[PDB]
């Protein structure tokens, strides 16, 4: 019977090779995820359809911010085949109320808090 799939924990334990591959540090990890739906919930079980609705990923190719806490990570582990996750990196600070309007999340994964449209 087709059932809901548990995934073992060894799957979610990084190796130093992977820290060389992607850009991560096991000490001081990232706070916020960017999650994007890149696959359809059609032809997927109803539980995955639900988790996609909870995480706020009904529209594809639209980024959503989440917390990197084990609850949200549990929901993300259920639908990890439909999404893409990158760390939200922040080169400058998080935006203050002065820089609240003039932001832009770039493709790299960074969120720039001063978004002019001039060349450097």
């Amino acid at each position: 019977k087709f059932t809901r799939s548990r995934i073992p924990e060894k799957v979610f334990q990084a190796s130093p090779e992977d820290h060389e591959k992607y850009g991560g540090d096991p000490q001081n990890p990232h706070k916020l995820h960017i999650v994007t739906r890149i696959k359809s919930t059609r032809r997927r079980p109803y539980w995955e359809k639900d988790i996609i609705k909870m995480l706020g990923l009904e529209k594809a190719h639209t980024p959503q911010v989440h917390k990197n806490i084990p609850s949200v990570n549990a929901k993300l582990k259920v639908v990890k085949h439909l999404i893409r996750i990158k760390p939200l990196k922040l080169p400058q600070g998080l935006p203050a109320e002065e820089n609240m309007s003039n932001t832009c999340l770039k493709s790299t994964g960074e969120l720039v808090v001063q978004w002019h449209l001039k060349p450097v």
Partner: protein
């Protein structure tokens, strides 16, 4: 008694209750009787299937024909036909219960040894009639020594350690990578993609 003893068609005590054909007694790697036990040569099953009585007579007959009893002894590993396979009467309509017991059968899974050989004999002597026997079997089989068995198991370890392919079936199935347990069995997490139905893929890592 260095010959194959007679294997009967059906045991003395019958089996009065009919059984469902639980075809998972063919599927997958065998657990019982995979290694040698006071043997040197065998007919390993590279796949699962059912042995009838007629198969047992093909093995007993065509082995005890070409065999030196003063040089070679042999042992059945697979027991007598015990699974009652039923057939309904010929050209009768469906329903009306389950058909009467027709004939008994043993299930043999892949990696099972069927007939052990032993004695003062080299492998190249016994390759011939065990290859003839191994071809008369219903499933794909092979005459295997001890050194050839450990040879091909060490080969399978070499395949599992040498491959430059980052994606194995084990990493994809158990992690549920591409949402792919929607297409797989729950047995494919333990068969690890080397078994499809009753067949066996030796070439597949």
């Amino acid at each position: 008694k260095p010959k194959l003893r007679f294997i009967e068609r059906a045991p003395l005590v019958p089996k009065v209750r009919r059984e469902p054909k639980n075809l998972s007694d063919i599927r997958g790697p065998s657990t019982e009787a995979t290694e040698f036990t006071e043997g040197n040569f065998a007919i390993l099953a590279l796949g699962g299937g059912y042995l009838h009585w007629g198969h047992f007579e093909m093995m007993r007959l065509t082995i005890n024909r070409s065999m030196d009893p003063k040089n070679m002894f042999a042992i059945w590993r697979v027991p007598a036909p015990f699974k009652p396979i039923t057939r309904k009467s010929v050209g009768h309509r469906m329903g009306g219960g389950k058909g009467a017991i027709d004939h008994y059968v043993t299930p043999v899974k892949a990696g099972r040894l069927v007939v052990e050989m032993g004695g003062r004999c080299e492998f190249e002597e016994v390759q011939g009639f065990l290859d003839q026997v191994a071809h008369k079997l219903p499933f794909a089989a092979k005459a295997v020594s001890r050194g050839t068995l450990e040879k091909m198991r060490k080969d399978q370890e070499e395949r599992e350690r040498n491959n430059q392919n980052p994606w194995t079936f084990e990493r994809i199935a158990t992690a549920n990578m591409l949402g792919i347990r929607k297409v797989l069995s729950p047995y494919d997490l333990t068969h690890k993609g080397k078994y499809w139905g009753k067949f066996y893929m030796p070439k597949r890592v």
